[PDB]
Ligand binder design. Structure first.
Ligand SMILES: CC(C)c1c(S(=O)(=O)N2CCOCC2)c(-c2ccccc2)c(-c2ccc(F)cc2)n1CC[C@@H](O)C[C@@H](O)CC(=O)O
Ligand SMILES: CC(C)c1c(S(=O)(=O)N2CCOCC2)c(-c2ccccc2)c(-c2ccc(F)cc2)n1CC[C@@H](O)C[C@@H](O)CC(=O)O
Ligand SMILES: CC(C)c1c(S(=O)(=O)N2CCOCC2)c(-c2ccccc2)c(-c2ccc(F)cc2)n1CC[C@@H](O)C[C@@H](O)CC(=O)O
Ligand SMILES: CC(C)c1c(S(=O)(=O)N2CCOCC2)c(-c2ccccc2)c(-c2ccc(F)cc2)n1CC[C@@H](O)C[C@@H](O)CC(=O)O
Lengths: 414, 410, 421, 421
């Protein structure tokens, strides 16, 4: 019945049944947003929402093979996802060992693309027999790129010139750096479009990817700049100048997050025996595919075979924002002849905008932390903040370089 | 635990028996892939062998692996498998698109994304619904061939542009499959190089493998007319697959889609907490001027990648294709009698998508496709489930654009 | 002695006298204190040179330094072909030095290439690259495509309506109706397959067609206006927003020109024996390829270039354009070029080079090519005017010559950079 | 009259006689029998004009039409400032019509802008845009940045070593040493913040610096060669591969110039009253915002443009550049412009407009600005030559005039398109 169920809620929600909580929502006694709190167990809230969603689907038995039980919804509710109806298993494979900077790495890769892990693994094997890869973090700084307007272009020119002064920058740094412990503002980058002004705030973020933090610092820095210029309107805390989750030449040219380089020398014997091609044939494909080919297609930053495959697989496995694959896959793969008789293959990848972290986001979840622990970069680095995030970026660049090696070889062979 | 020589089928052995067999070097580790009978147990032993090689051997404790269908994953989706990664799934809906109502699954770990998208759907719902059209459909592969001279590569270009030359190439390409039907070829020469862009429908598949087999067969036929042509690479980055490229933005790849909606001024005020005037000002100066100042090709939107990515992971798509599939331009305009209502549209020229093959063969991913009524192939109208899913992506993206842009305007 | 204003007006209105019977000072006296505005000088004065003379005198009194114009020449120039066709408010002309680089050994022919420039060493450097190609057995070129474009933006009431128009233009019957209208406007109007693009309820339509030997912009614009008039008959609520919506794309950087082409798409190539690379270019083939890979491909890529995969194609393109009466502002798109270099021949010491230029926007008729001095430069190359026996052949030959000269420019600059100063 | 070869050579190598004593036919005979090289005519002949005459005569009998140079003028031109400076193998000169658009009301001053062009209606269009600006209270402009660049490519044995070099250049003390070596080559050389980028073992270094009133390419390249020599002392395994690795980026389309700027970054603006938009421009404010949005922004975006969010900035840039002795090949990057338009004033019926041009590559000394006709146009604008008491001020002013004139030509072309016809 209806009105007797109503009273039991006032006196806990554990004493009702599934059907009786949705006898009170299909008939509208209680409204359909308060379910969140009333129920005490997290997994029962998900069950109820699956049953409510069930009623609206033409095929309600769809949900049966979408799993949901035995998952830790405590770290997900109010942090990583809303309207949660379960989870989506992504098969994880391992490619390694990856000999990178004198260590070995077993790299997890969440994908449903056949042969991708097997290909990457072969690439790691070739790198290993050639003495391993070396890599460097060239730069580190997440950004946010708001757009403010002033009454005139002459005004925004004066605000820009004031920001490029020592005194102006320092007042904006103080406001930015007071919001957070890792908020340390580097040189600004501005651009005028008439009376519009786009300001690129850049800062290291510890081991976090850093968008929450960079945003808070940006908001306070715009508030201080508003005191200094009261006529200034703050249009959008992001004006696409960052640039987050969209292709942009500013990320390719200035960097965003970690800028990283990676290299390796593959002996001629190893190129023939493992990779089934030659050094000549590899350089010929790299030149005419990754350079000339991408050039004919009108690419900015896409001078690689399939960096996006590897970045995405690692990102999903390691609790990253997979959407940031758009910019994070920016890569240029270079190949040339090397060694005494010019038969060995030098290879390098440069990825100037890897947006990555080992704290926050999906790295708070325990399964994702398992993959980060495989690599030895899980959570913050207590003695050198940001080194875990930098190490993971190095790993992605090296694994990307392994995947470039392997796929390019298979293409050169036929 | 019995001695090594006695155990030398696999089902009758214990875990520690197989492992001590490998560590004593009586049997290579790679030979276990074949010898072990059950797939779940092969994963279990690989995890245990792997764990000892880590500086933290307990690191795989919370990476789950039990009770999952590895029969659809081995030899199809993933290798060297050590488990699975659970991505939380939320629902945004109802999305009121083309007179139907969709409950859209989104696999994400970004807080507030699903909720934000959901508020956008609500706005579109009270605005009467969104409409959408597929404008084009054709996945591509862009191999590169070499001739001895640029004069010879120009010969091949002009030959492929003749109707008789294109006709024999189409015949070869189309013989490889039911759904392989070759539309107009696009070619560019760079010296003695020649980049040929094979475009064709692929039924309800995304069509990577299918277009590739048709491409190999077509290039073989081209080799009969031009024996000195060398196939340098079956992909010469001219497709373009999983890299940012203007060609995808200008010619399209996969499904080209448009979506639109008019939100009443009252709904913008009460649901989205802003005005039409303020939204448009932000759209102009963010998604047009801003993306222009940052040097964007195809990124004239706020966060289309967020929505594309979450849907793709939920629905068994190749999530690495969000690079090109997230290509979007969001327009906003004053509409209505007094210019107070909000016309919004999103154009997505290269949504790379499918509802058969790949990750859409796995059962949980199929559940999400089934929620939307697009799982599997369409017997009556081949390619209609895939087309419908592309329309759903564009419409959810538009709902995401609406909601985020509203929050930024306020 | 300059008569009062009123008496000078009587003379001006006297139809068998007019401005000829007035003094320069009297005309100026009439302009100062109005009666004649200034734009009416061109239509009132006996001869074209006197209008220029008077305009210069008026202008001079408005400047801080009244002798500014002294070394700006204006006399003895054929203003008859310029007034009302090439320029307005004319105060003189700017002489650009014309040098000559050649012979350019192209397709078993020889070309002496004129080059208007004020950049020191440009002609010499280009002339040396010509020498390398000549002693190397010469170069070969092909025109791969031909078709000037125009990209109007139109507007339907809804995105669904613009999609319907897009689909209708894609049917063979709807395309045939717009093709008939487009083609009716001029003798060379032949609409090739259409390219369209939706942005919501906007529809961008790239009309492409050959234009004989004309560059073809006025002609394509006229066919476009007629074609869109026909389209509105089928779609009455379509608004023609602009005849150019920047989808052409004319005189701005744009990836669509690079990918689809605009005007003449062209490729040129040569093989330079090791002997010639040494003696003429002062370097090796290995050095050249090293620079070519890491500057023109990798360097351009790091710079975020679209279509700019070359050393200085724009230097050559600009110098020929100015000499040959082209629109020099179309240097933006016409300079698009990718220069490739690989090892070849005996010890991998011969240099195979090629340039590919997909959007050379050029013509041997119309605009500045109606003027006799820039016609002299076209006559040098044997490409002046229209080709009666083979329409478009003169313009095609000029685009082949531009590509061949760019490659010579590339050869020579790249060799200087491969030496280390 | 024609003499044998041996008798001709003795008189030529005779100091007190020379080529003055030889005739035209005799010098041509020596060049044909290969005694003397053709490029050497520059230095052996007594008159510049006679060298041009003999060059023309040689050229003419190599051509299929021997009279093709008839209307290519060459006599009475001042070849002294050209020879050994601006052009080689000179056979004459190309007159480009010059016209005036103005007054351009910019920063409370008035400018009469010279424009070398052969495109009909361009000057008239631009003049109408000026008229509308002047009636709307004139235009204001600001120079946001000033700094010509050069982007060499160097190489290390490994990417890790080039990462070392990048880190070293980023420290305050490493940059101080490179700055000292750069600044020692000239008094105008003041090195700004260094931009670098790694591609494997390659390293692209963007040296940026003001150049006085010169465009500054030779000044920056010299300072770059000294700075790289100093870098080599600290990093001896470094190889300079090319002094330009296309990272500057000079005369090619590149996002780095759009984003970082090159030479003069400038912004102009104005507010045109609703009355003026109606009467002068034959349209409305609302109609032009709609066209600017869907053409110059959306349209350019659909075309795949980087930096080309404008109507025809390249027309204005090219025209002023040729008239004022600039390198017209540099309109490639210099034309970079985004044109924006909004409603303004108490009733939102007035037109706000702005143009932003981040990479104007310009100068009032060097190259073609040394020639007198080109200098005449510079004197028109009051910017001819080096400014004594405020170095760089003339080139900055000219850049401000170029951005204001572009804005004039944007207003005018955009209004015409918004109206129709
Ligand atoms: C790594 C991946 C599993 C893979 C491989 S593979 O791993 O090397 N291979 C070897 C043979 O057995 C199957 C597995 C290959 C491949 C297949 C045959 C010949 C050469 C290479 C292809 C492949 C690429 C372009 C084609 F046209 C068609 C197939 N792909 C897909 C890559 C794909 O995800 C991005 C790719 O499209 C990016 C690009 O190169 O444009
Ligand atoms: C949808 C998502 C959860 C979201 C939201 S939100 O859902 O709309 N919101 C409203 C209620 O408050 C909590 C969260 C917001 C946001 C937050 C505050 C004000 C306005 C908007 C931001 C956000 C964007 C740019 C910022 F600078 C800082 C925060 N994001 C992140 C989008 C992000 O994933 C791509 C974004 O970077 C793409 C872009 O616009 O450049
Ligand atoms: C052709 C032109 C006359 C020319 C030449 S030159 O003709 O080869 N040279 C030989 C020596 O005597 C002087 C004249 C050179 C040059 C000079 C020294 C070493 C190597 C080459 C340079 C030059 C290029 C890039 C530099 F960084 C610095 C000088 N330029 C300018 C080209 C210029 O207009 C586009 C160029 O910037 C495109 C590019 O390479 O980025
Ligand atoms: C300034 C120039 C002389 C000019 C003018 S004009 O000066 O305004 N006009 C006034 C009326 O008398 C004729 C000349 C026009 C024009 C013509 C008709 C309607 C509106 C404008 C066009 C023109 C533009 C786009 C067309 F599709 C076709 C003609 N052009 C050519 C511009 C051209 O050099 C760059 C242009 O192609 C860049 C672009 O807008 O994409």
């Amino acid at each position: 019945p209806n009105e007797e169920c109503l009273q039991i809620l006032g006196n806990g929600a554990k004493f009702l049944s599934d059907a009786e909580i949705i006898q009170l929502v299909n008939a509208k006694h209680i409204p359909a947003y308060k379910l969140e709190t009333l129920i005490e167990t997290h997994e029962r809230g998900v069950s109820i929402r699956r049953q409510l969603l069930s009623k609206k689907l033409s095929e309600p038995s769809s949900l049966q093979y979408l799993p949901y039980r035995d998952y830790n919804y405590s770290l997900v509710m109010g942090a990583c996802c809303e309207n949660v109806i379960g989870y989506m298993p992504i098969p994880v494979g391992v490619a390694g060992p990856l000999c990178l900077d004198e260590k070995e790495f077993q790299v997890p890769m969440a994908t449903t693309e056949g042969c991708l892990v097997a290909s990457t693994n072969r690439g790691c094997r070739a790198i290993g027999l050639g003495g391993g890869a070396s890599s460097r973090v060239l730069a580190d700084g997440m950004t946010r790129g708001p757009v403010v307007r002033l009454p005139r272009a002459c005004d925004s020119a004066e605000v820009k010139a004031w920001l490029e002064t020592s005194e102006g920058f320092a007042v904006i740094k103080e406001a930015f750096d007071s919001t957070s412990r890792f908020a340390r503002l580097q040189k600004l980058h501005t651009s005028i479009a008439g009376r519009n002004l786009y300001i690129r705030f850049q800062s290291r973020s510890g081991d976090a990817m850093g968008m929450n933090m960079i945003s808070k610092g940006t908001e306070k820095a715009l508030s201080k700049l508003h005191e200094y210029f009261p006529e200034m309107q703050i249009l959008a805390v992001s004006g696409n100048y960052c640039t987050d989750k969209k292709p942009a030449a500013i990320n390719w040219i200035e960097g965003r997050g970690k800028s990283v380089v990676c290299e390796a020398v593959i002996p001629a014997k190893v190129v023939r025996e493992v990779l089934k091609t030659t050094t000549e044939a590899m350089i010929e494909v790299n030149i005419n595919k990754n350079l000339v080919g991408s050039a004919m297609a009108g690419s900015i930053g896409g001078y690689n075979a399939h960096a996006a495959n590897i970045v995405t697989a690692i990102y999903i496995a390691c609790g990253q924002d997979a959407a940031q694959n758009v910019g994070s896959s920016n890569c240029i793969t270079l190949m040339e002849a090397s060694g005494p008789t010019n038969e060995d293959l030098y290879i390098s990848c440069t990825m100037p905008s890897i947006e990555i972290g080992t704290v926050g986001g999906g790295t708070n979840l325990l399964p994702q932390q398992a993959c980060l622990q495989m690599l030895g970069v899980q959570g913050a680095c207590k003695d050198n903040p940001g080194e875990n995030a930098r190490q993971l970026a190095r790993i992605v660049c090296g694994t990307v370089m392994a995947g470039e090696l392997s796929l390019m070889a298979a293409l050169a062979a036929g």
